[PDB]
């Protein structure tokens, strides 16, 4: 299963054991990895005209920055800052899915979970940000109590 | 044909509420700081550059405050505590006078001359702490 | 936009406005001129009309209006060969 996106196809019990493969290509190998973008800048300095392929490298950089920061912000509002599997205090509402653990973790892929739960994630994200905000308020005045 | 369902908290909805119950809605404004209406579901138009300039500005301002959180001891958090003691020449108000009575944007217009002095002391006690946490790991 | 733009009522806040120092007006004024000049730039330059225009008012129950505010004017235009002239009228 090792290799980028190689666990697509396996069930999500075994596809979640190798999450390091995805969170290294999407954190390291995006902006830090390439130094050849500044080898094409001097070749754009040789020609004195702004070309079509110089505009498309703006739009592929600003899409690359925003795609990186809009997944680290969302992991920053929650308590899951620098980790890959984190737990929350949000109880699972059975009207999101009534489906058992053995059907989910052992007979369903992640790509079949995208096409089931996607209408509900905007509601789920509200309840993770709200419970994280209630937690840090509670551990501040507890801290100030002693 | 649509219709308004149940309502929840919304963006800036706790502005002018108070100071202690507007800090229970910190994630609502912190969610709307990076992605706006610019992201939806042929080249070099006047409205094309003005949309692209709004996307480069929105990253520069976000990374500005996100840098400043990590220089402090407070990364990935919403409420953090420091070791800098509060100085009454910055503001002398009581504890039940800024909480439960004051709102933000009234406290903002009060200490906005002193924030550059406050920001320097948070950064200085973070250098002094991280050297000490290094020098505690030599035993 | 898949939702139409919305409006959240903010409670207990006051705010000073000033319609004579609002910069949304000066930003909108530079944009309406910018969009105006973008469109006229690929259109046709019309320097072959700087010539003389020899003409007499129009020819003709009766029409009896617009006789002193409108006239056909004939002139030597250019053709698509830059060697020939064409005798061309216009109101």
């Amino acid at each position: 299963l090792f290799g980028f996106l190689g666990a697509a196809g396996s069930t999500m019990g075994a596809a979640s054991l190798t999450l390091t493969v995805q969170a290294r290509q999407l954190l390291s190998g995006i902006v830090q990895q390439q130094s050849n973008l500044l080898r094409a800048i001097e070749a754009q300095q040789h020609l004195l005209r702004l070309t079509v392929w110089g505009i498309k490298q703006l739009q592929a950089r600003v899409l690359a920055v925003e795609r990186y920061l809009s997944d680290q912000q969302l992991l920053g509002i929650w308590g899951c800052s620098g980790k890959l599997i984190c737990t929350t205090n949000v109880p699972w509402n059975s009207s999101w899915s009534n489906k058992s653990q053995d059907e989910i973790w052992n007979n369903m892929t992640w790509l079949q979970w995208d096409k089931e739960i996607s209408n509900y994630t905007d509601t789920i994200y509200y309840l993770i940000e709200k419970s994280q905000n209630q937690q840090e308020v509670n551990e501040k005045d507890l801290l100030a109590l002693d | 044909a649509v219709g308004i369902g149940a309502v929840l908290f919304g963006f800036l909805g706790a502005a002018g509420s108070t100071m202690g119950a507007a800090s229970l809605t910190l994630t609502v404004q912190a969610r709307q700081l990076l992605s706006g209406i610019v992201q939806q579901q042929l080249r070099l138009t006047v409205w094309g550059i003005k949309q692209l300039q709004a996307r480069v500005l929105a990253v520069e301002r976000y990374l500005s405050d996100q840098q400043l959180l990590g220089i402090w001891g407070c990364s990935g958090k919403l409420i953090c505590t420091t070791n800098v003691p509060w100085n009454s020449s910055w503001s002398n108000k009581s504890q039940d006078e800024i909480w439960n009575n004051m709102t933000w944007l009234q406290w903002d217009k009060e200490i906005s001359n002193y924030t550059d002095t406050i920001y320097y002391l948070i950064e200085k006690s973070q250098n002094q702490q991280e050297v000490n946490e290094k020098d505690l790991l030599a035993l | 936009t898949d939702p139409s733009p919305q409006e959240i009522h903010l409670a207990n806040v006051t705010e000073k406005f000033d319609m004579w120092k609002n910069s949304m007006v000066e930003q909108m004024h530079t944009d309406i001129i910018s969009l105006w000049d973008e469109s006229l730039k690929p259109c046709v330059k019309l320097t072959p009309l700087c010539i003389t225009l020899n003409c007499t008012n129009i020819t003709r129950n009766l029409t009896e209006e617009g006789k002193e505010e409108l006239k056909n004017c004939s002139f030597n235009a250019t053709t698509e060969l830059r060697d020939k002239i064409q005798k061309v009228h216009s109101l």
Partner: antibody
Framework: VQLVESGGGVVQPGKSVRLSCVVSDFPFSKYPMYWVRQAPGKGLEWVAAISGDAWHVVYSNSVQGRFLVSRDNVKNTLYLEMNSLKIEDTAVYRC????????????????????????????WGQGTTVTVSS | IVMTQTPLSLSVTPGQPASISCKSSESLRQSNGKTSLYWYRQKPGQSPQLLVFEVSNRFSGVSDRFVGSGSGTDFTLRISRVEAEDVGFYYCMQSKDFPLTFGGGTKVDLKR
């Protein structure tokens, strides 16, 4: 599919009725339902609309504050109440179903609201009538 | 939103195609990009019946003689080769905003 109605009859002005519209072999918690109204020798009107969530209901302007729409997702039924009946309501009341299921409420993050989605028709009911008389 | 139709009644010949148009005041293009125009059919003493549930696309179980067209506010419904199953009442319905109004209604007849 089959859409069955009942509960219609003859009353006085200033009374209360309870129409009903039982469905056959739906999920029925996915489909929001309607109520149209056809006077004799007239065109169709619109009366009310409940969602599959059974949370957000809307009424027409002329019938506001007088009617009451509910549903029971266990029994697969519609429950149209009426109150303070006028004279001009002598017509035929058909329940109806949207041609596709509206999904869940869609939370808008910027204002914190939930939104329901409404659309057209598949299946009008049989068509029951209420005639008010003296 | 109001609705008006032309005409109020047709008098046609079997085998000859005809058309019925609806007119809306406000444009019915939703924020989805898809419109909200609905074409119905009520036989006399009968339940109504959907025919075309957009500008264009046809209901599952309706013959291909009924074609729909239009955009904005101008819309039509062009019956191809009017037959004995194509008489009665034809309606327009919007679903852009509440209240969900119906059109006026035509009465398609032949010449006995």
């Amino acid at each position: 599919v089959q859409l069955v109605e009942s509960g219609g009859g003859v009353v006085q002005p200033g009374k209360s009725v309870r129409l009903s519209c039982v469905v056959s072999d739906f999920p029925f918690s996915k489909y929001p339902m309607y109520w149209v109204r056809q006077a004799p020798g007239k065109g169709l009107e619109w009366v009310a609309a409940i969602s599959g969530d059974a949370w957000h209901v809307v009424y027409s302007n002329s019938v506001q504050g007088r009617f009451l729409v509910s549903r029971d997702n266990v029994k697969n039924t519609l429950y149209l109440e009426m109150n303070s009946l006028k004279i001009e309501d002598t017509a035929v009341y058909r329940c109806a179903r949207m041609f596709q299921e509206s999904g869940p409420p869609r939370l808008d993050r910027w204002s914190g609201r939930n939104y329901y989605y409404y659309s057209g028709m598949d299946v009008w009911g049989q068509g029951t009538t209420v005639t008010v008389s003296s | 939103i109001v609705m008006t139709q032309t005409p109020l009644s047709l008098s046609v010949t079997p085998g000859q195609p005809a058309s019925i148009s609806c007119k809306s005041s406000e444009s019915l293009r939703q924020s989805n990009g898809k419109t909200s125009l609905y074409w119905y059919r009520q036989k006399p003493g009968q339940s109504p019946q959907l025919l075309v549930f957009e500008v264009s696309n046809r209901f599952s179980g309706v013959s291909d003689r009924f074609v729909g067209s239009g955009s904005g506010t101008d819309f039509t419904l062009r019956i191809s080769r009017v037959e004995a199953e194509d008489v009665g009442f034809y309606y327009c319905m919007q679903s852009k905003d509440f209240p969900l109004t119906f059109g006026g209604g035509t009465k398609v007849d032949l010449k006995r």
